[PDB]
Design a protein around this nucleic acid. Structure first.
Ligand SMILES: [Mg+2]
Ligand SMILES: [Mg+2]
Ligand SMILES: [Mg+2]
Ligand SMILES: [Mg+2]
Ligand SMILES: [Mg+2]
Ligand SMILES: [Mg+2]
Ligand SMILES: [Mg+2]
Ligand SMILES: [Mg+2]
Ligand SMILES: [Mg+2]
Ligand SMILES: [Mg+2]
Ligand SMILES: [Mg+2]
Ligand SMILES: [Mg+2]
Ligand SMILES: [Mg+2]
Ligand SMILES: [Mg+2]
Ligand SMILES: [Mg+2]
Ligand SMILES: [Mg+2]
Ligand SMILES: [Mg+2]
Ligand SMILES: [Mg+2]
Ligand SMILES: [Mg+2]
Ligand SMILES: [Mg+2]
Ligand SMILES: [Mg+2]
Ligand SMILES: [Mg+2]
Ligand SMILES: [Mg+2]
Ligand SMILES: [Mg+2]
Ligand SMILES: [Mg+2]
Ligand SMILES: [Mg+2]
Ligand SMILES: [Mg+2]
Ligand SMILES: [Mg+2]
Ligand SMILES: [Mg+2]
Ligand SMILES: [Mg+2]
Ligand SMILES: [Mg+2]
Ligand SMILES: [Mg+2]
Ligand SMILES: [Mg+2]
Ligand SMILES: [Mg+2]
Ligand SMILES: [Mg+2]
Ligand SMILES: [Mg+2]
Ligand SMILES: [Mg+2]
Ligand SMILES: [Mg+2]
Ligand SMILES: [Mg+2]
Ligand SMILES: [Mg+2]
Ligand SMILES: [Mg+2]
Ligand SMILES: [Mg+2]
Ligand SMILES: [Mg+2]
Ligand SMILES: [Mg+2]
Ligand SMILES: [Mg+2]
Ligand SMILES: [Mg+2]
Ligand SMILES: [Mg+2]
Ligand SMILES: [Mg+2]
Ligand SMILES: [Mg+2]
Ligand SMILES: [Mg+2]
Ligand SMILES: [Mg+2]
Ligand SMILES: [Mg+2]
Ligand SMILES: [Mg+2]
Ligand SMILES: [Mg+2]
Ligand SMILES: [Mg+2]
Ligand SMILES: [Mg+2]
Ligand SMILES: [Mg+2]
Ligand SMILES: [Mg+2]
Ligand SMILES: [Mg+2]
Ligand SMILES: [Mg+2]
Ligand SMILES: [Mg+2]
Ligand SMILES: [Mg+2]
Ligand SMILES: [Mg+2]
Ligand SMILES: [Mg+2]
Ligand SMILES: [Mg+2]
Ligand SMILES: [Mg+2]
Ligand SMILES: [Mg+2]
Ligand SMILES: [Mg+2]
Ligand SMILES: [Mg+2]
Ligand SMILES: [Mg+2]
Ligand SMILES: [Mg+2]
Ligand SMILES: [Mg+2]
Ligand SMILES: [Mg+2]
Ligand SMILES: [Mg+2]
Ligand SMILES: [Mg+2]
Ligand SMILES: [Mg+2]
Ligand SMILES: [Mg+2]
Ligand SMILES: [Mg+2]
Ligand SMILES: [Mg+2]
Ligand SMILES: [Mg+2]
Ligand SMILES: [Mg+2]
Ligand SMILES: [Mg+2]
Ligand SMILES: [Mg+2]
Ligand SMILES: [Mg+2]
Ligand SMILES: [Mg+2]
Ligand SMILES: [Mg+2]
Ligand SMILES: [Mg+2]
Ligand SMILES: [Mg+2]
Ligand SMILES: [Mg+2]
Ligand SMILES: [Mg+2]
Ligand SMILES: [Mg+2]
Ligand SMILES: [Mg+2]
Ligand SMILES: [Mg+2]
Ligand SMILES: [Mg+2]
Ligand SMILES: [Mg+2]
Ligand SMILES: [Mg+2]
Ligand SMILES: [Mg+2]
Ligand SMILES: [Mg+2]
Ligand SMILES: [Mg+2]
Ligand SMILES: [Mg+2]
Ligand SMILES: [Mg+2]
Ligand SMILES: [Mg+2]
Ligand SMILES: [Mg+2]
Ligand SMILES: [Mg+2]
Ligand SMILES: [Mg+2]
Ligand SMILES: [Mg+2]
Ligand SMILES: [Mg+2]
Ligand SMILES: [Mg+2]
Ligand SMILES: [Mg+2]
Ligand SMILES: [Mg+2]
Ligand SMILES: [Mg+2]
Ligand SMILES: [Mg+2]
Ligand SMILES: [Mg+2]
Ligand SMILES: [Mg+2]
Ligand SMILES: [Mg+2]
Ligand SMILES: [Mg+2]
Ligand SMILES: [Mg+2]
Ligand SMILES: [Mg+2]
Ligand SMILES: [Mg+2]
Ligand SMILES: [Mg+2]
Ligand SMILES: [Mg+2]
Ligand SMILES: [Mg+2]
Ligand SMILES: [Mg+2]
Ligand SMILES: [Mg+2]
Ligand SMILES: [Mg+2]
Ligand SMILES: [Mg+2]
Ligand SMILES: [Mg+2]
Ligand SMILES: [Mg+2]
Ligand SMILES: [Mg+2]
Ligand SMILES: [Mg+2]
Ligand SMILES: [Mg+2]
Ligand SMILES: [Mg+2]
Ligand SMILES: [Mg+2]
Ligand SMILES: [Mg+2]
Ligand SMILES: [Mg+2]
Ligand SMILES: [Mg+2]
Ligand SMILES: [Mg+2]
Ligand SMILES: [Mg+2]
Ligand SMILES: [Mg+2]
Ligand SMILES: [Mg+2]
Ligand SMILES: [Mg+2]
Ligand SMILES: [Mg+2]
Ligand SMILES: [Mg+2]
Ligand SMILES: [Mg+2]
Ligand SMILES: [Mg+2]
Ligand SMILES: [Mg+2]
Ligand SMILES: [Mg+2]
Ligand SMILES: [Mg+2]
Ligand SMILES: [Mg+2]
Ligand SMILES: [Mg+2]
Ligand SMILES: [Mg+2]
Ligand SMILES: [Mg+2]
Ligand SMILES: [Mg+2]
Ligand SMILES: [Mg+2]
Ligand SMILES: [Mg+2]
Ligand SMILES: [Mg+2]
Ligand SMILES: [Mg+2]
Ligand SMILES: [Mg+2]
Ligand SMILES: [Mg+2]
Ligand SMILES: [Mg+2]
Ligand SMILES: [Mg+2]
Ligand SMILES: [Mg+2]
Ligand SMILES: [Mg+2]
Ligand SMILES: [Mg+2]
Ligand SMILES: [Mg+2]
Ligand SMILES: [Mg+2]
Ligand SMILES: [Mg+2]
Ligand SMILES: [Mg+2]
Ligand SMILES: [Mg+2]
Ligand SMILES: [Mg+2]
Ligand SMILES: [Mg+2]
Ligand SMILES: [Mg+2]
Ligand SMILES: [Mg+2]
Ligand SMILES: [Mg+2]
Ligand SMILES: [Mg+2]
Ligand SMILES: [Mg+2]
Ligand SMILES: [Mg+2]
Ligand SMILES: [Mg+2]
Ligand SMILES: [Mg+2]
Ligand SMILES: [Mg+2]
Ligand SMILES: [Mg+2]
Ligand SMILES: [Mg+2]
Ligand SMILES: [Mg+2]
Ligand SMILES: [Mg+2]
Ligand SMILES: [Mg+2]
Ligand SMILES: [Mg+2]
Ligand SMILES: [Mg+2]
Ligand SMILES: [Mg+2]
Ligand SMILES: [Mg+2]
Ligand SMILES: [Mg+2]
Ligand SMILES: [Mg+2]
Ligand SMILES: [Mg+2]
Ligand SMILES: [Mg+2]
Ligand SMILES: [Mg+2]
Ligand SMILES: [Mg+2]
Ligand SMILES: [Mg+2]
Ligand SMILES: [Mg+2]
Ligand SMILES: [Mg+2]
Ligand SMILES: [Mg+2]
Lengths: 110, 59, 77, 203, 141
RNA sequence: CUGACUGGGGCCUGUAGAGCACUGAUAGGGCUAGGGGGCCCACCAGCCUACCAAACCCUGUCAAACUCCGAAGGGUCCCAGGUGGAGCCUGGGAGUGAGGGCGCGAGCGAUAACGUCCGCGUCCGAGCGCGGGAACAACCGAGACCGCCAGCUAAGGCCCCCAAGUCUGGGCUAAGUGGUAAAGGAUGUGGCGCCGCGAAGACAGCCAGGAGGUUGGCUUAGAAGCAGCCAUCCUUUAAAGAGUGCGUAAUAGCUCACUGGUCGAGUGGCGCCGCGCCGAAAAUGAUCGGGGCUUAAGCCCAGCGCCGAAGCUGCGGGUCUGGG
RNA sequence: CGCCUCCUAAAAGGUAACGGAGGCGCCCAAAGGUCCCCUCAGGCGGGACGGAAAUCCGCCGGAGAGCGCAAGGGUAGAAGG
RNA sequence: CGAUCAACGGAUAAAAGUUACCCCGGGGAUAACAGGCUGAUCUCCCCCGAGCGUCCACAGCGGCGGGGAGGUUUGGCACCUCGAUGUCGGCUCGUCGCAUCCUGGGGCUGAAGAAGGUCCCAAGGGUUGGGCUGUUCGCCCAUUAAAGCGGCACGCGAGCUG
RNA sequence: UCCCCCGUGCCCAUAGCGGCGUGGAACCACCCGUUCCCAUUCCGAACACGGAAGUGAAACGCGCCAGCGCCGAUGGUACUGGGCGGGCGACCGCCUGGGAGAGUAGGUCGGUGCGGGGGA
């Protein structure tokens, strides 16, 4: 018996894989926000970034934009440029939208 | 080892693939013996037409 | 005496068109089906009537993923 | 009481060959062992009719052992109605599930009015220790009328033996007999031609 | 007499009668049984004849178990017509019975009472039959 | 060299079989809405149901258009064997587009037709050429280039017709069964087993006893064991049913069942297997092809030998293809 | 008498009969494209008019609902709202 | 864009009947007759033993069901015959089967006698005349030991009738 | 390289239903508010934002139990490719290779990849 959270999750994630891109999946908890870029062909994570690993400050929204500029920064160093955004169960808005835009300024392509 | 295969019973009346099997062994006439190497592909055909043939293992 | 029956339809010649380990070109039809008996996997498109066909030159592979259904793939050569 | 039966170990000998030579193919198993056996069909039958799946049969193996087993499964030849294969389940100190007879003591009041005691279960499934095998379990059916019935719930159990089915299960019943007086209605009871379950704009 | 109260389809293809019974091959309810020795379509008319005969011996007493049921619809073309113009009409119902099935079982009766009704029953049937009583083999299935 | 066929390997499938989880069917039981019925009520609830019966559970089953399962096989692709009146490509010339029998898998029909319609195969067609099957396109054997007064076999045969055994060893059958049929019926005969009852003396025969409650009932017009069923209970017993048959208008009578005397060893009922008996009537004259056959010249088991074709071999020849 | 679905059909494809059963000769300006969100039938319990069945609350419920129309296939990790 | 060109690969833009007044080319590729195969239907005989018969299952009977034989009915199929296999009934002449109508021999009987019933054996011989109708069949009259039932291309038209 | 947790996959119920127990430092969750972004065919329930007083009550994670569900041999059988017999048939046998389904024994209260965070 699935839940709206679970179904919505598959619902967007399934459409992302099919386009074959590297996925910039984003996790957003009550305090923190994590993001890892995954190659689903190997079941393997290639680069990560999280607020909790960066020990970042207060405002969740700016925190997101900063973990975003971070993820890109480590990313372009591995040649990763093209990638696709996994908004998971999270509406593209607020904290998640902010991380996305951070990744963009960083130069990651999407 | 080789296989000495003898056609002792006529293929007239048997399905065509059995008749074809005799042809892969190069058997055309009754009482005719042919000596063939014992590999699986040769033996599969031999075992297909075993009801038409008398086999002996030699050399 | 008469029949209120009598009719039937033209057969549709459905089923798998290319089996696993067979080399196909981009465009080749792989499976003809009513509904998703098989699902498109890597390098496999699906047409408006469920027809699975190859997106790239290569080699067919099937995969039975349980409750996730059966999938057809093409592996680049 | 207790039954014994010589068994023998079999290898590649064909079941076909064995049964024609008068013997009965079988298998021996439990958690630790699994062995192909054969027994004499004529000797086995003599035992089994008394034994059934109720009483422990012990198998004098020619290698010198003597094993304590229950006959767990029997395969019959459906055309000829002759046993063709036996499963011997070798007991051990651990409890085991099994079938234990029911002896419906008493003659039911339903029977004395013309009725028939429909013995649904002539045994009952039960978890119990090998050391605790009852000869049966008694049942008071003398109180039964047409159509009154006893259950697995109404089963009064011997010491150390726990019931292995749902007590909801019915076990015996007393039902009305056949009567030639019912013929008058039964031949004069009207039967209708059969109704087709539909296809199309009918379903 | 016996016939399905309703069915998904009106007419059924004829099929085959190869092999021994799939099941129904062991005593299950009564004390004695009547088992089929050869294959056949036993009609409802025979089953009822056989049944009635058995209750007729018992008079008052016993219980009769019918383990076969006529669900196969039997077709016949109307007299004197030629081949074609569709499938015949359903005219009766049959029980498809293979060698080794119990068709009838009896209960609550002396052994001679049972041997005899099962015998008389047996004459009413289009096949050879064997009478059997419940054994531990039956018990063990 | 890519072919039919064959080996390995992958992928595809929903049949045979089976199963009841879905769609339906389905016998009995349990439990239990709904009604019907019988009590008590009109103050509206209640109680009983050997009544019909939903859903559920149990036991047990059925299905082309049901499937939780699910083969053997089959299709296809890769690598390999496969040099064949194999295969592929381009062109010229056709004929055929009435099939038929048989085997297996189905539908139709009536688990009818030398019936009909499909599938896989086969033969005839075109092998009505040859051997066997009495005779006979398609059952068995076998693919006829020609010649030989040579040899080996195939099916089938080896008493005479009629080529080769009146061949060898073990059994069965007495019906000319063999040499055309079924439900069913039977002290046919042989062979296995299963229970009783018996030298605490059986069975057969020769001998008695077979009784009391009791002409016993829910019972009617007779119902006394012997016209329905819902009775089988005691007693003297050595034994003997409130009765296995004949008898009756009901009885009674004879008798079994059951005990005692006589002799002195077996006796009685189930069942299964082999081979036979009945069931068995149709039209020109009979007949297994004929004669004729009985420890077979019949049937089952196991052998040795021979006979047997245009199959195979030997000798010679022809023609085409291929290699010298 | 053309077309679609199922069975016959012998687990590739194909396969006949005056064999067994049903449907089509339309429809939709959204019942189309896409983005976003949402999950059914049914059962039990609870609720004014309110019923077997309207709408409301809770718990159980993998799909037995739905997908215009026949049937099959498909399908809620949506093709359904 | 104009097709129930729906006989749906759609002969014309445009089309229904009848022939016992008939014809030709073909077919036993296909009906009608007879035969053949089949035997549902038909006739006959069995198995079972509910029940009837005052009593008594079986003198005579046989519920519900089951097994066959025959090849006289009504049919199925389409195998020889369509460069012809003449077709109902009658007459004539028969010959055969036996599931026997009579005559002969029997068993059982609910066989007193006489006379019947029922089954078994038996195909040697016999089995009438007339009214009606095209009739076969059937009904009727008068008799009789009896007034049998079937096969032979529903025997028999190079034998007759029509 | 080991333990716990947060992510995200693979295997596709040996992973599930139920019952009992356990975890809040950390992570996660509920939670505290509805100013702001954003939101309710009504509702800050959802989605969303700003937060950190409390609580592991719900959820989740981790363990335990075989009542249900799920998986499930060995043996034997059905059936069968190919090869042979038998019956008037319905149908029935033998040889060789293949071999279910049911049921029985029994197994199961998940295993594993990658990246993070913490601890030894
Ligand atoms: Mg992986
Ligand atoms: Mg041959
Ligand atoms: Mg041949
Ligand atoms: Mg073959
Ligand atoms: Mg030759
Ligand atoms: Mg040849
Ligand atoms: Mg009509
Ligand atoms: Mg019609
Ligand atoms: Mg049709
Ligand atoms: Mg078709
Ligand atoms: Mg077609
Ligand atoms: Mg079709
Ligand atoms: Mg396919
Ligand atoms: Mg598309
Ligand atoms: Mg589409
Ligand atoms: Mg694979
Ligand atoms: Mg792949
Ligand atoms: Mg409709
Ligand atoms: Mg049929
Ligand atoms: Mg019938
Ligand atoms: Mg029929
Ligand atoms: Mg009508
Ligand atoms: Mg028809
Ligand atoms: Mg019909
Ligand atoms: Mg009928
Ligand atoms: Mg059966
Ligand atoms: Mg009978
Ligand atoms: Mg069972
Ligand atoms: Mg090659
Ligand atoms: Mg090739
Ligand atoms: Mg090839
Ligand atoms: Mg191959
Ligand atoms: Mg089947
Ligand atoms: Mg079902
Ligand atoms: Mg079950
Ligand atoms: Mg079936
Ligand atoms: Mg089917
Ligand atoms: Mg099926
Ligand atoms: Mg396979
Ligand atoms: Mg096929
Ligand atoms: Mg193959
Ligand atoms: Mg293959
Ligand atoms: Mg090659
Ligand atoms: Mg050629
Ligand atoms: Mg050629
Ligand atoms: Mg060449
Ligand atoms: Mg030319
Ligand atoms: Mg042409
Ligand atoms: Mg032609
Ligand atoms: Mg034709
Ligand atoms: Mg044609
Ligand atoms: Mg044809
Ligand atoms: Mg052909
Ligand atoms: Mg012929
Ligand atoms: Mg055969
Ligand atoms: Mg056939
Ligand atoms: Mg068919
Ligand atoms: Mg018949
Ligand atoms: Mg034909
Ligand atoms: Mg035929
Ligand atoms: Mg046929
Ligand atoms: Mg053919
Ligand atoms: Mg020709
Ligand atoms: Mg020939
Ligand atoms: Mg030829
Ligand atoms: Mg000759
Ligand atoms: Mg010949
Ligand atoms: Mg000849
Ligand atoms: Mg010939
Ligand atoms: Mg030649
Ligand atoms: Mg010379
Ligand atoms: Mg010789
Ligand atoms: Mg020979
Ligand atoms: Mg001879
Ligand atoms: Mg001679
Ligand atoms: Mg001799
Ligand atoms: Mg005689
Ligand atoms: Mg003779
Ligand atoms: Mg004779
Ligand atoms: Mg007999
Ligand atoms: Mg006898
Ligand atoms: Mg005998
Ligand atoms: Mg007296
Ligand atoms: Mg006779
Ligand atoms: Mg001898
Ligand atoms: Mg010769
Ligand atoms: Mg030659
Ligand atoms: Mg030469
Ligand atoms: Mg059209
Ligand atoms: Mg098909
Ligand atoms: Mg199919
Ligand atoms: Mg197919
Ligand atoms: Mg194709
Ligand atoms: Mg229509
Ligand atoms: Mg809209
Ligand atoms: Mg839509
Ligand atoms: Mg929209
Ligand atoms: Mg609801
Ligand atoms: Mg409610
Ligand atoms: Mg209300
Ligand atoms: Mg309501
Ligand atoms: Mg649905
Ligand atoms: Mg126009
Ligand atoms: Mg129309
Ligand atoms: Mg036309
Ligand atoms: Mg027209
Ligand atoms: Mg067309
Ligand atoms: Mg025109
Ligand atoms: Mg015009
Ligand atoms: Mg016109
Ligand atoms: Mg005209
Ligand atoms: Mg004319
Ligand atoms: Mg005129
Ligand atoms: Mg005129
Ligand atoms: Mg005139
Ligand atoms: Mg004129
Ligand atoms: Mg004129
Ligand atoms: Mg003229
Ligand atoms: Mg003319
Ligand atoms: Mg003709
Ligand atoms: Mg024609
Ligand atoms: Mg004609
Ligand atoms: Mg005719
Ligand atoms: Mg003729
Ligand atoms: Mg007949
Ligand atoms: Mg006949
Ligand atoms: Mg008879
Ligand atoms: Mg009698
Ligand atoms: Mg009477
Ligand atoms: Mg009498
Ligand atoms: Mg009476
Ligand atoms: Mg009689
Ligand atoms: Mg009658
Ligand atoms: Mg009959
Ligand atoms: Mg008859
Ligand atoms: Mg005739
Ligand atoms: Mg005739
Ligand atoms: Mg006719
Ligand atoms: Mg005729
Ligand atoms: Mg004809
Ligand atoms: Mg004709
Ligand atoms: Mg024809
Ligand atoms: Mg003609
Ligand atoms: Mg002429
Ligand atoms: Mg002429
Ligand atoms: Mg002429
Ligand atoms: Mg002439
Ligand atoms: Mg006579
Ligand atoms: Mg006389
Ligand atoms: Mg007299
Ligand atoms: Mg008198
Ligand atoms: Mg007399
Ligand atoms: Mg007599
Ligand atoms: Mg005479
Ligand atoms: Mg004479
Ligand atoms: Mg005469
Ligand atoms: Mg006159
Ligand atoms: Mg006259
Ligand atoms: Mg007249
Ligand atoms: Mg006149
Ligand atoms: Mg008349
Ligand atoms: Mg007289
Ligand atoms: Mg007269
Ligand atoms: Mg005459
Ligand atoms: Mg005549
Ligand atoms: Mg004539
Ligand atoms: Mg004439
Ligand atoms: Mg004339
Ligand atoms: Mg004339
Ligand atoms: Mg003439
Ligand atoms: Mg003439
Ligand atoms: Mg004349
Ligand atoms: Mg005239
Ligand atoms: Mg996790
Ligand atoms: Mg994981
Ligand atoms: Mg749990
Ligand atoms: Mg706690
Ligand atoms: Mg917990
Ligand atoms: Mg905390
Ligand atoms: Mg704390
Ligand atoms: Mg706070
Ligand atoms: Mg505000
Ligand atoms: Mg603010
Ligand atoms: Mg809130
Ligand atoms: Mg908690
Ligand atoms: Mg969550
Ligand atoms: Mg455990
Ligand atoms: Mg499974
Ligand atoms: Mg299993
Ligand atoms: Mg196995
Ligand atoms: Mg075979
Ligand atoms: Mg078999
Ligand atoms: Mg085998
Ligand atoms: Mg094997
Ligand atoms: Mg299977
Ligand atoms: Mg299994
Ligand atoms: Mg578990
Ligand atoms: Mg890890
Ligand atoms: Mg770590």
């Amino acid at each position: 018996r699935l839940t709206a959270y679970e179904r919505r999750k598959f619902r967007v994630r399934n459409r992302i894989k099919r386009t074959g891109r590297l996925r910039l999946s984003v996790f957003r908890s009550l305090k923190h926000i994590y993001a890892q870029i995954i190659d689903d062909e190997k079941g393997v994570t290639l680069v990560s970034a999280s607020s909790l690993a960066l020990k970042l400050k207060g405002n969740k929204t700016e925190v997101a934009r900063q973990v975003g500029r971070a993820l890109a920064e480590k990313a372009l160093a591995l040649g990763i440029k093209q990638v696709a955004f996994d908004r998971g169960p999270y509406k593209y808005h607020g904290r998640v939208k902010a991380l996305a835009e951070g990744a963009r300024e960083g130069g990651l392509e999407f | 080892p080789r296989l000495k295969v003898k056609l002792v019973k006529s293929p007239i009346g048997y399905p065509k693939d059995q008749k074809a099997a005799l042809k892969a062994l190069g058997l055309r006439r009754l009482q005719q013996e042919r000596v063939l190497e014992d590999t699986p592909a040769i033996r599969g055909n031999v075992e297909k037409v075993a009801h038409l043939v008398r086999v002996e293992v030699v050399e | 005496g008469s029949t209120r029956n009598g009719r039937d339809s033209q057969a549709k010649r459905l089923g798998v068109k290319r089996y696993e380990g067979q080399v196909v070109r981009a465009g080749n039809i792989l499976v003809r089906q009513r509904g998703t008996r098989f699902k498109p996997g890597k390098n496999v498109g699906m047409g408006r009537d469920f027809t699975l066909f190859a997106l790239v030159d290569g080699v067919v592979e099937f995969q039975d993923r349980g409750r996730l259904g059966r999938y057809v793939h093409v592996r680049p050569l | 009481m207790e039954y014994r039966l010589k068994a023998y170990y079999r290898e590649g000998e064909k079941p076909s060959a064995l049964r024609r030579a008068g013997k009965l193919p079988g298998v021996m198993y439990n958690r630790h062992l699994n062995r192909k056996v054969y027994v004499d069909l004529v000797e086995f039958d003599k035992v089994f009719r008394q034994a059934s799946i109720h009483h422990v049969i012990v198998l004098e193996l020619p290698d010198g052992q003597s094993l304590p087993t229950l006959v767990r499964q029997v395969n019959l030849d459906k055309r000829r109605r002759r046993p063709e294969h036996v499963d011997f389940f070798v007991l051990s100190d651990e409890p085991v599930e099994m079938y234990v007879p029911l002896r419906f003591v008493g003659t039911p009041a339903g029977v004395r009015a013309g009725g028939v005691l429909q013995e649904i279960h002539r045994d009952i499934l039960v978890k119990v220790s090998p050391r605790n095998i009852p000869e049966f379990i008694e049942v008071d059916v003398s109180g039964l009328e047409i159509g009154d019935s006893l259950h697995a719930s109404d089963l009064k159990l011997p010491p150390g033996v726990e019931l292995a089915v749902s007590p909801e299960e019915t076990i015996a019943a007393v039902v009305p007999p056949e009567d030639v007086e019912k013929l008058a209605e039964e031949a004069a009871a009207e039967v209708a031609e059969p109704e087709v379950i539909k296809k199309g704009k009918e379903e | 007499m016996l016939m399905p109260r309703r069915m998904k389809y009106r007419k059924q293809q004829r099929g085959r009668l190869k092999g021994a019974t799939k099941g129904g091959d062991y005593v299950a309810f009564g004390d004695y049984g009547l088992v089929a020795l050869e294959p056949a379509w036993i009609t409802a008319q025979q089953i009822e004849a056989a049944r009635v005969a058995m209750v007729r011996h018992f008079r008052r007493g016993g219980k009769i178990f019918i383990r076969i049921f006529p669900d196969k619809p039997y077709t016949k073309k109307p007299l004197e017509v030629r081949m074609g113009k569709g499938k015949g009409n359903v005219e009766g119902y049959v029980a498809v019975v293979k060698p080794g099935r119990v068709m009838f079982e009896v209960a609550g009766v002396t052994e001679e009472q049972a041997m005899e009704a099962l015998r008389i029953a047996g004459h009413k049937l289009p096949i050879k039959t064997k009478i059997v009583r419940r054994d531990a083999y039956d018990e063990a299935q």
